[PDB]
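Dear all,

This email documents one entry for the complex benchmark we are building for the journal club exercise. For each entry we list the sequence lines for every component of the assembly. Then comes the predicted three-dimensional structure of the complex as a C-alpha cell string, followed by one or two observations. Please use this as the template for your own entries, and keep the labels exactly as they appear.
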Amino acid sequence: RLPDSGPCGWILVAFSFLFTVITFPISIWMCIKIIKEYERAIIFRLGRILQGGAKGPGLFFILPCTDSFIKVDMRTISFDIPPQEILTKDSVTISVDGVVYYRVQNATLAVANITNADSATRLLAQTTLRNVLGTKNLSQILSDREEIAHNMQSTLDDATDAWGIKVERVEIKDVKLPVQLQRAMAAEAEASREARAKVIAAEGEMNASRALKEASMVITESPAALQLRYLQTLTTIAAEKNSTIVFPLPIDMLQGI
Amino acid sequence: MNASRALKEASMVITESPAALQLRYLQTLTTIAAEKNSTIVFPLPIDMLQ
Ligand code: NA
C-alpha cells in the first residue's frame, strides 16, 4: 500500500562515499543509525523511498548528503484534550474534558501521506466526540459508555486508516453544568430527601400533640390567657434581627364608623 | 393540544378527593421559593377565641 501523495546519481553517491571515508573517524557517527524494537525508520535516497516496508530494528547506514531519514515511534501515546463546549440532544449546555489514546499502525503512511499525524489525530478526536454526544440525551451520556465508544470507533477508523493511525480509546474525565442549571437539574435528589423529612416531621407533630391539648384545656378555662400568650410571642419575635411592623388598632373606634 | 389528554386524566383522579388539589398548590409554592427574586406574602389566619 503506497501513499496517495541514474548516472548523475552515482556521481553524487560516489562523492559522498569518498567524502565520508575522507572524514571517517568523524562522519561515521552520522552514517550509523540504530533503531530499537519499538521504532521504525523511513529512508529516502535521492528523494526515492527505499523499496519495501519501513526498516525494522537494528543497525543501519546512510549517507547524510544523499539520504534523508525519519524515525517513527510505534508505541501507544495518550493526550489530554483541551476542554470543549457541547450541546446534548435535549439541548443542555455542558462542558467536557476528554482524553485520547492512539498508536501508529503503518509508519510509511504516517510519514508520507499526512503532514502532521499527531495534530490531525488530536483534532479528529475532538470533533468526533462533539458529534456523538450531540446525538444523546444527558441521561444517556451517563449510562451508555459502551454504545458511545462503539459509535466513535467506526467513525475514527474510517478517517485515520489513510494516515496509518489507530485510535484506541476516547474517554471523558470531567463534565460540568453551568451554575444557573445546577439546582434545577438536581430536583430528583432534592425531592427524595425532602420526602423522608416530611415523614419525620409528621411524627414530631404526633408526639407533641398531647401536651398541646393539655395546655389548651387549661388555657380555655380563662380565655384571655391566649391573648397573654400572643403578646409574649410578639416580644420574642421583636428581639430577632429582622424588621417588625406593629399596628395598634383601636377596634372600638373603628366600630363607630 | 398534545398535553391536554394527560391533564384531563390527572384532573379526574385529583378531583375525587377534595384536599388533593390543595396539596398540589402547596408543592408548587415550595418549587417557586427556590428561584431568585421570588417574594412570597403569607397570611396566617389566627383565632383568639372571643
Ligand atoms: Na482533556
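Observations: The pocket of sodium ion is lined by residues A 80-81, 97-99 (CB under 6 Å). The two ends of chain B are 53 Å apart (CA to CA).
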